[PDB]
Each structure stands twice: as structure tokens, then as C-alpha cells.
Amino acid sequence: DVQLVESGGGLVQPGGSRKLSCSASGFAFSSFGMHWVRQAPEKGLEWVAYISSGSGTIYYADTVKGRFTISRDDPKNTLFLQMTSLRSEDTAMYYCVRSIYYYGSSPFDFWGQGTTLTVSSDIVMTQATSSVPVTPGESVSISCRSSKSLLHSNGNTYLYWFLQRPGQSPQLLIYRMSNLASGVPDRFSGSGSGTAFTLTISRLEAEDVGVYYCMQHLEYPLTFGAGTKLEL
Amino acid sequence: DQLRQEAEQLKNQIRDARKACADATLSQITNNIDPVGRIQMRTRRTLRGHLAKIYAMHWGTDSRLLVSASQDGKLIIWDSYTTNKVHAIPLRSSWVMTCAYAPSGNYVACGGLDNICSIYNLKTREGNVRVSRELAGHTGYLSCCRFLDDNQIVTSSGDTTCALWDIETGQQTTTFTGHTGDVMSLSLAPDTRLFVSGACDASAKLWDVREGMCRQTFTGHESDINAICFFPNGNAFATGSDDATCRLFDLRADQELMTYSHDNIICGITSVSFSKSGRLLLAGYDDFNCNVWDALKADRAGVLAGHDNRVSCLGVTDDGMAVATGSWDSFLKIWN
């Protein structure tokens, strides 16, 4: 099936250099806009870099502009993030994620497993609630307030919901606040308006607990929410 | 031995019966109805990606995506709003004479001059589209493919047979064989319960998807009929022929209602399709333009003349917001 795996972890001395390689296997890698998203040891996700299909477009986060470089080798199905002068705030897991952009597509659908790499005027997505206890059987309502009208002139509200299970890679739940992901149960359903959003999970059950990150996609760099932990 | 004389007797009875229930002279009824005046449609977008003649198109149920098959050996799925191409499907047999698009928008059916209505799969993992099936069994050539569900597809071939397929297994579950000449066009119903096939015998037959028996046979044409489209009500259908006369048949009255012919038109029809209301009747001619016939008074309303070569396909959206004509220029316009 679809399989994203990264390598080049371990511990590095500060101000050094390292290369992270994400070797894709089991999909047309030659036509997927691949991102790099990191996660601090105990914080939410943060966007790092992005490479488009055919290497025609590149972006970086403001923190890692000019310090990192992203490159893809299509014939080998690998994705490289060559990093230089590693600061003390880069200790994180680095997920390589695929994204395909056409009309009615589901970008950020599959997430790599990630490798722990230790060292020794944008939209702020204020996911206000940080923790809430729940019991199986009931429904809980998670809210994510944006800081800018995400409803574009096209009619879409570029806001995604990700679910990260304990010791897993976060999977896509809903894309553009309405559409369900591929192979997700019908319990999840998004609603709201511009600068206000909600993910109303119905008849919540076991194996559905974890943290829920809301990510705007209207403008770069992508800003994930602080995440709401569903404690059982 | 003398049975064809009895067949002629029955045919005479049929013609007498269908003539004895004819007193309207529809023009006589719609005389008092005020005309639509004159409609002018301007090409909003010029979908320009193909490098050879295009023979078929089909609008998605979304009324946004249209797929257009061509002779360069690619059917590419457009986005009619932003002109963007969302898929480029490199098909095997470059000779493609028809195209479909699943009502859900999951599958797209190809098929041309090699007896295989080969369906593709769009909404899949792994990115690129795959050949889900290659439905073989026909002995002529695929002329139309139309999706019933994501599992059933009817195909009208050039061996005088229309066949209902089964995508999952890939077998002819039902064979409709009543024609004598090539079946040039086919059109499903709003309820998708019974269709008609346009044949080279100058005769359209009313099939039944469930049973597999031709219920009614509509004659009146002089030459091959190249295009059929149902009236949105589902109780009438237009018929484009090589005699330059689009005709409105009626499924209830069992007979032709009216004919759409102008003396200064000599070219053959390639595609017909009603508007959403079923008032104006599009008709794609070989005069490098498609005329807009008022479908209740027979008088021409407008003209869509922006093509350098003959138009092969003409689709109306499921919300009547736009039409799309595809000529042998490799360009297909979206009028409005």
C-alpha cells in the first residue's frame, strides 16, 4: 500500500549539519506535492518546508528560511531536507506528508512515521480548549477559532482537521471544513463559518482519543492549532 | 414462407393506429405561445489542450468537470470554471469515438474503434488513474458509452447491438438486438429505467434496461441518425440525422410530433441536447456551427458559430448554466 518512511535521525551537535531522507513506496510520487512538518517533544505540529510536483515551487517556514533546503529525486522516489547550523529548538520528530492539489482532492491525506532528530503577518489558529475529559458513547464538540476570514472568493474555507493517536502519525479527518477524508468513519462532521469552526464527533467510542490539530491552508506558512487532547 | 406479408399487415395496422390518434399538429397548439425572441450566447471559455480532433464529451453531475476524448490518444478531464485540467488519462487505442462520466464522478468510460468500452478509475489512492476494466465482447465498434451506476454501463456498438454490462464481473448481463444497421448514438432516461438507441437504419427504438425488449420503434427519417437526447420530462426525445432534420418523437403518442428543418441547411446533425427546461433544442451541424431550435415552434432562435471545423459533441450541464460544443479544431467552447 502507500508507505512513507524517513531516515537520518539520532542526536547532532548544535551548529552542525544533517540530511533527512523520506523514501516513498507504493504511489505515483512524481505528481505529489510533498511537505515537511515537525513536532516539538511535547508541543503541536509546525510546518517546516514544501516541495511542489516537478520541483517548480518551494516554500519554507519563517524560522527555517535559508537555514534548511528541500530537494526531491523523482526517479528514486525519495525526499531530501538538507539542514545546516541546527539550533537548540530543532529537537523534534519530522513527518514527510504527501499532498495532491487538483479540484476536489484531499491534500495531507497520508503522513510518514517520522524520525526523532535531537540536538544538544500570518494566521494564528487559536484552538482555545487544550484538554477535555470524555466517556465512550456520547458526542463532544471541538472548536478552532481562526484570526482571518478563511472563506476565499472561490467558496471553500481552507481549514483541515488532523487526529494524532497516542504514539502515531496524525491522519487527515476532514478537508475544507465539510468533506470527510478517504476511509474515515461517518462519526466526524465539520461545520461553522469564517473565523469560527467546529469538529462535532458524534457517538464517540474507544480508539478515537488523542489530540486534534486544526490547520489553515489559505496562506503559507501553514499554522497548526495548539491541539485539543481528548482524555478518556 | 408468406410470414413477411403478415409482418407488412401488422406494420400497416401500426401506422393506421398511430395515425388515428393524431389530431394536434403541435405547431397548431403552440401557435398562441409567445416565442423566446432571439438568444445570443458568447463563448465564456475556450478549453484548449488537445492536439487532434475531439469526438465526444460528457459533463459531470457536479456541472463543473467535463471529460473530452480525442484522437491524439488522451481524454483529459477539464475544470469548466478555471479552464484547469485535473487529469490527463493516456489511453492505449488512440482511436476513441465516445466518452462517458459516472454520475457520482468516480469512473470515466472510454472506448473507440477496437471493440472495448474501457472504463477508468479517478477517485483512487496512489494518485494517477488506472484501467478498472476493459469490457470486451462487441464485434463492431463502440459508438456511445453511458453510465447507469458505478457498476452498470450500457454500450451501443457498430454490430447492430446495444449491450448492458456489469463492471464488477465485466460481462454482458443483457444484449439489446433489434436493429439492422450500426447503432450511432444512445441516451439514458432521467429515471435511468429505459433508454433509446439511434441506428443507421433511420429508426430509433425504445429499449427497456430491466427486461431487454424494444417496446416501441420510431421511423420517419430518410438517412442515418447520429445523435439522440431525451426531453428532460422523459416522455420525448430529439433525433439528429444526415437529412438536416432534427425531429421531436413522443414516447406516449408513439409517433413523431414535429421536424426542425431550414431550406438553407444541407449538412448532417452530429449532437442534439435539450436545455434544462426543454424549451430550446441545441443541434450540432457540419456547417461548423450549432443552431438553437425553439423545441415547440420549429423556428430557429439563435446561432453558436465560433468553430473552424464541424462539431462532434454538444453537452448541456445538469443545471442548464452552460452548453459545451466540441469541434475537430481540438478546441471545445463553453457558451452561455
Place this chain on the structure above:
Amino acid sequence: HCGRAAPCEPLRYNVCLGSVLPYGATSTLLAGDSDSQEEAHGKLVLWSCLRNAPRCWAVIQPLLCAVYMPKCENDRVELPSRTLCQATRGPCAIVERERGWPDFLRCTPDRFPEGCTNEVQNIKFNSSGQCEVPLVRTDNPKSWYEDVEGCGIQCQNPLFTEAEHQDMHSYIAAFGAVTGLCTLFTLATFVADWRNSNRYPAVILFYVNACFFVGSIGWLAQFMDGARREIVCRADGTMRLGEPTSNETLSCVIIFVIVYYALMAGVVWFVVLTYAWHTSFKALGTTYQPLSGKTSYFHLLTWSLPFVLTVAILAVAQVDGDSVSGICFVGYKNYRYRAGFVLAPIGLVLIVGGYFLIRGVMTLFSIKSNHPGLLSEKAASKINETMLRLGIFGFLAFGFVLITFSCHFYDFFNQAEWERSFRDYVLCQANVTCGDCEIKNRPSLLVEKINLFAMFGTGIAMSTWVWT
């Protein structure tokens, strides 16, 4: 301090030749040449010949009739101040240039002392200003007869008699008409089947023809009601110079830009056509079309280079008109700009076109020997026909470039002659009018005719391809 003791007599003539004398006593000591009143009057009426070129006459007249007819103060002649000299030294080097200022007029400290009354400012010459037939009164220092001050050469070149003008006008009308007709015919042929005739080298040929037609109609914007006069003549009554000036109207700037851009686009499209022919003939057979990718690059280069050239022309403002040609064109006055901006592009076009055409001919000559199979006589016939066609057309283009080069170089040398010759004529006319005369050598009109024949002939020869 600015007066000498001399016995002065009562005056007999009461005028400064324009202004009346306000006194009744005068001596003739100041004039080194003139000793008596009659000789003083003789010298005054000889100086009266300076009526033309008023930019110096208006300023010298007071000093003129002051040095010959002064005012004595009780056997003490009045000597004017240095300022009246310095006002009549810089711009009035013409008499110095031709005849020279006599030593009595060359004001030396013992002759003209510094800082005393002139007494002449009451004598003002309000009736001042004239230029005879070969000149016109002008108020622009840029557009004057540089050899003189004030007056300016008229619109119609005095080097050419009106007969030559009429002959050239009729010549231009006829050849313009023929070129326009051939180019319109080929444009009509190309546009009649435009849905079929879109094959690129043919379309490049169409663009050459269209450009040369625009050039031809740009030439034929004269013979109208009053177009020529508003194109080649200024409002003040001189020929156009150093256009676009910020004062005068953009009347012939448009007539210049269309004809120059048309000609340059024509020759550049021709170079691109020849290159397209070479690259096509290199891959004749093997169903491989190379130029399908670089069609747009051709379009942009050929449409850009003449435009940047003509804006570089309008940047340094020397574009000007001519009466005989009936057109504003670059570098009539200063031959350097004409030489560069005309011959360097045309010369480069000849070189590149020539090279690529010889390459094309050698290619489709060697094609038969290089082809693996045997060519049917029906194909080899057309290949040899088109080869001879390219050979003839190439020789014709080379001939036309050699003609225009020869005509220009003749113009350069004989023009370096005619400028001096014409000045000598103007001085001769001033001299005979002071106390007939003809220009020694004029431009031969046949070289003008041959130059315009070269241009129109090019315009025709670019349209003979549609002929089969």
C-alpha cells in the same frame, strides 16, 4: 576721456538708413577708410547690405550709424563705449569670416574708451528683419542656417529646382502605387485562405509583405489636400529639424515611425524567413518540424528589435523631413546617424540572410546525394526549381543592398561637397544683391530615384513568391 578734438561740419543726409538723426553736426575722423561725408554715406549704404540676417543688423545699426555719423560736442567728437562692441562681436563673426572688421571698427582702447555715454540709444531701428528667397526668418537657434545668424533655410531644398520636385513626387506616387498593389494582392491571397495558409514560413512571408505594405502606405501619405506641407514644413516656414522638439506638433513623427518600423520589421522578418528556410531544408523529410517551438521567439525578436531601434532613434532627436522625398527620416542633417542606423542594420541583414540562404541552397543541393532511396524525377524537379528560385532571390537581395550602399556613399561624399557649394551660392547671392548666380554642383536626382527604386523593388521582390 572718450573724446578727441576734431573740427565737425553740419550733416547733409538726415537718416541712419532707417532712423532720423537728432543732431546737426558730424565729423568723419572715426572711419579709418572714410575721410569726407560723401565717402561716409557711400560706406553707410554699402553696410546697408546687412538688412538680411537681422539677429546682427538690429544690434550693429546703432554702432554702424554712430561710427560713421557721430555727434561732436564743440569740436569734441563722441566715441561710443566698449559694451556696443561686445554686443556686436560674438554672434556677428560673419563679416569677420567673409571680409573682416576694418581696424577702425576693430575697437582698440585708444579708439573705443571704456565707461561713457553712447548718445545712440535714442536711435532705435524698429523696422528690422528680412531674409531673401533662399532663407526664411526663424526664431529657433537649433534650426538656423548655422553659417549665418537669425535667418533659416526654407522647406523646399534650394539644391533642387521645382521641376526636380515634381519629377520626384510623380516617381514616388507611381512606384508607391505599384508596390502597394503587389503587397495588397499577396496579402489578399494569404488572407483569402487564412484558415488553410497558416503554415509558418508562408505566414512569415505574409508578415514581410504586410510590413512592406504598411511601409508603402506610410510613403503614400502625401499627394493629399495639404499633408506634405504639414509633414515636411514647420509653421514658421522652414524644413523640419531635430524632431521631436517639445514645442512643435507630432505631425511627421508618426509618418517617420510607421515607415522606419515597417522597413526594419520587413528586413528582420526576411532574415527570420531565411533562417526558417535553412532550418526547414536541413530536416526536409523525416517528418520533424524544428521551428514549431521557436515560432514565438521569432515573433518577439522580429517585433521587438525594430521598436527598440526606432525608440533609440526618437531618444537622440535628429529625425527630420525632406521636401523631394516628402517624408521625415533619420539623419538628413548629420550623416553619421543615417550611416549607422540605416546601413548597419541593412548590412547585418545582408550578411546573416546571405549566409543562411547559401546554407539552405547547399543543403537542398546535397539532399539528393544524401537521401538513402532514389528521388522520383517529379520531386527532384521541384527541388531544383526551388533551388534556382532561392539563388535568383538571394542575388536580387544582394544587388539591392549593393545599390542602396553605393547610392548612400555617393550621397555622403557629394553632400560634403554640396554643403560648401550651397554656402558659396548664398554668399554669391548676398554679394550680387549688395552691389545671375547659380550653384556650381547640385545632387543628381537619379541617385534618389535609384534609392527609392531599391526600396520599392525590395518591397515587390518579397511578394513575387505567391506568383506560381
Place this chain on the structure above:
Amino acid sequence: IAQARKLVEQLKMEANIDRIKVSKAAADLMAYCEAHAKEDPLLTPVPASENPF
């Protein structure tokens, strides 16, 4: 001659069909055609507000 038999059987099966008078069929066509004159964006050209093209 099984083709001729099948053709005659098809004509016999097609014979017993309940015909409706063209008056009523025409009236139904016209009635449906007139009842949807408002929801047809080609008859009445919708302004540049709603028109997505």
C-alpha cells in the same frame, strides 16, 4: 426464417400499446416546458452576479 418469425413476434408485442392523442401529449410537453421557464439559465440570461462563467 426464424428472423422473420422473431420480427413478426416483435411487431405483435409492439401492436398492443395504449396510444395517447397528440393533443394531450403536446399539452403535457408545453405545460412542463412552460412550468420550468424560470429555472432555465439559457432562456432568461442570468446576470453576472449568479453566472459562474
Place this chain on the structure above:
Amino acid sequence: LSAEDKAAVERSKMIDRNLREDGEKAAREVKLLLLGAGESGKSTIVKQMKGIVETHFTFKDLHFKMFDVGGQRSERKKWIHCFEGVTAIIFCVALSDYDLVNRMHESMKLFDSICNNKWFTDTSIILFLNKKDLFEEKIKKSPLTICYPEYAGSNTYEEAAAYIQCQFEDLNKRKDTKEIYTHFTCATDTKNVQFVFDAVTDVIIKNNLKDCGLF
């Protein structure tokens, strides 16, 4: 535009470039529509050089494609327009079937129908008068008069074959636009491919010089 709309347009442009490149690569191969009556000997000529059947072969750095559509029983005029813009039309005619049943008359009628078609008004025709060896020995028994009552000449192969050739060549009513090349198929030689190459390169040179605006 938006974040995803720019990436959608980028994808659109990338696949547009892919279409352009594939079109440029597919326009370099010579197409050869292979007509001919049933049992004309199409199998012999198609094997000699290498629904619808596409055979791809290369000769002297040219890629040819032959679409022998005779394995399809439908109305020809409904799909024959699909093959307009083909380089040539290889029309192989059985020569030994002058006696068989009239079949020569059927081949002639098909040639007449295909050579004066609206779409193939421009496309040159190659015809292969194949099975010459059977025809050479078949003349001794059956004179040519069986097929052509209007024949007047010697009953030898070298004259009868030339008569058949000149009879077939006189069917095109358009003699100025389209040329009709002819070859008597050489069994044990590779000259059939050479003749096809020569005819195709000739029509290509003519089309390319017309394309070059000179002819």
C-alpha cells in the same frame, strides 16, 4: 487565486507540458492506413515489412504505423473520416483473383470509393498488385477477357499486368492533387519496404515543401 488554486494551475501547466511533449513525440511517426478487399493478400504484405490491428515497424530512421481496419464489418463511411490526415493509403489488390467470383471488379469499386472520398482528396495512394507469380502462370489457362471484355492486346504477363496497372491508375478523377504509386510485390526481396519508404518520403518531401511556402 488561493494557496491550493495556484498548485492546481501548476499541476494543469505540468500535465499541459506533458501533453505537448507526447504530441510532439507522437507526430514524428508516419501513419499508413491499409485498405484492401478481403483475401487481397494483406497478411503477406504486413508480415513482409515486420477490431483495429496496429503494426509498428522502423526503416531508415522512420517509424511507420499500419492500421489494417479490414478486420471490422461495419458501415465504412461512419468511421473512415477518423483516418483523414494519414500520410498514405496502402491499397493492396490481389492480382491472381481476376478470374475468381468479378472479385477484381469488387476491388476496383472499393479503390474507386476510397480514392474519390471527400477526406482522402489530398492523401496519396500506394497500391500493391501482389501475388504476381500466381497471375503469371494463371494467364496460360484463363485469358484476361474473362474480367475485361474491352481488352485488346497480347495474352502475355508483361502486357496484361501493365494493362491492370493502367486500368487501376485511371480510377482517380483527381490526378493533380494525389499521386498513385504502384509496385508488383517482390516475394523473396525486402524491396516492398524500400518502395513504401520511397513513396512515403516523396509525399513527405512534397507536403514539407508545400508547408515551407515554396512547393
